[model samples]
Target: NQIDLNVTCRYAGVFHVEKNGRYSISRTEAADLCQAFNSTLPTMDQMKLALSKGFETCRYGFIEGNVVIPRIHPNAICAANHTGVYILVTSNTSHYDTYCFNASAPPEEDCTSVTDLPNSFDGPVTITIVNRDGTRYSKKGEYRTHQEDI
Candidate 1:
């Protein structure tokens, strides 16, 4: 179980406002603000300016405070025809779980999005299906792992 806790700020109604991603706040005038740093500290002016805009934002350790967005690399989406399914992804890196975000029976064209996908979510998720032995059916079964809400 790999989980990363980001305890810098909460965006009031907005759970997050990713640095390199786009997410809209449905309806809100303002959001709670916070500031945190691993090392060193922000000057009085820096802190004042950093916390100036009271809008909810979701940034990582290096992403803010002192500054830098922690980018999640090697997001892969895999699918197979049979239960003994194993699909090699482009990233070629190993993971305890796969990262897929397409449809179950995605069209061939839809796969274009899976190429070199990156971790774009601030959450943890693992998607897996039951594996049956020697069961062959004309079923359009598929599964994938992905970083949702990117």
Candidate 2:
């Protein structure tokens, strides 16, 4: 499927994910966590974009190249009075939260021609169900389905 770069995806954004507690995730684990959320680690530019958009958190999160702590307002407890995107240099094994980028977008081609259905649907439909651990439900009754007669 070809994606429309000009069209914004409803899920497209930068967000932070935290585990059990603050500073509890290693770099490797951070990557895996983002993947679990169907996203990837954000780059410096992505983080900057988020920062410019008023996204701020006192907790440190892992971004591409290095760790970053975003602060819209200066605080003594966070980044030691620093504001904006603060780059923290430390070992890869350091524990921290994660910043994930959701770059996914809808396809350019219309599905109506192929599916014979309108682009918009009014009701909710079950396409897939996933668990927190990244495992999908496999039971027959786990999801709703539509049956048509031949």
Candidate 3:
């Protein structure tokens, strides 16, 4: 991703996963809650990206698409008949967890002959490398790629 893209996978959260882990709150609160974190409710596109990137919980969230529909994976209550399982709800009367997005993108390092792929957590990762000598090489450390000059 480009550094100047203005958006990244850096900031996504279930707005105030408070009270019950299945936290559900009114729409007004959801919007305000995300604002507290310098973020806003995610749009349909962003929400879809988050899900593909592992931000899932089998819970419904208010998405900023057209009618501000609740987006979710196929599950009960919200139903899966609609597109991506979206259904309309009364804004003032609707209450559910929200998908929030922070504007800042993640730190990006240049391809210094080696690059590290971002992971869900900051856990250690391994990388596969190939040398000009035609032998396969692997690093068992957390670096994106072998930072050493071949």
Model 2 Cα lDDT, one tens digit per residue, 46-101: 77777776667777888887888877899999898899889886554677777777
Against the unseen true structure, what C-alpha lDDT does each candidate score? 0.21, 0.54, 0.41
The TM-score obtained by model 2 is: 0.58
Q: Look at candidate 2 and tell me the lDDT of residue 85.
A: 87
- How close to the true structure is residue 128 of candidate 1, measured as C-alpha lDDT? 18
lDDT per residue (tens digit) for residues 1-150 in model 1: 221211222111111222212222111100111111111222223222333333212222211122212112222321222111122334322212111111232222221111111222233423111212212111221111222312
Clash totals for all candidate models = 5, 0, 1
By TM-score, the best candidate is 2
Cα error of candidate 3 at position 141, Å: 40
Error of 3 at 19 (Å): 4.5
Model 1 TM-score is 0.15
